[PDB]
Design a protein around this ligand. Sequence first.
Ligand SMILES: CCCCCCCCCCCCCCCC(=O)O
Length: 119
Amino acid sequence: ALKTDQILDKLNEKLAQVDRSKRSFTVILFVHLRQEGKVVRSVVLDFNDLKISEIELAVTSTADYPAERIDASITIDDNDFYLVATKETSFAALIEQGKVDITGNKQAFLTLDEKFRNK
Ligand SMILES: CCCCCCCCCCCCCCCC(=O)O
C-alpha cells in the first residue's frame, strides 16, 4: 500500500486528455519507488504510448523496454513521488535536496516538471 496508489487515477486522467496525433515528448522513464530505503514497486512512465504500467520489481530493463530504449530512471521515495504528482514539489527541488537518484538523461525529468505543470 503506497501513497502513490492514491494518485494513479488522477494521472491516468491527465494522460487520457493528451492529444494523440501531435506527439513531441515521447521519453520512456523507469520509476523505482522506495519505502524505508528499499525499492518496493517499479513503474514505467511511457510517454510514447501514454501509459503508466507496473513492471518487474527494481529491474533495469524488460523485454518490452530494453536498455537502449530507456531514456532515464529515477529511484525516489513513495512519499516524494506522491508530492511531485500532487504538485506540492518538483523533480528539480528533490534533486537540489539530494533526495533522488537519476540515471540516464536527467534533463528528461526537468522537462517533465515543465510539461506537467500545465496539465
Ligand atoms: C510527475 C508525474 C507525471 C506522470 C504523468 C503525468 C500525466 C501528464 C504529464 C504531462 C504529459 C506530457 C504531454 C506531452 C505531449 C507531447 O508533446 O507529446
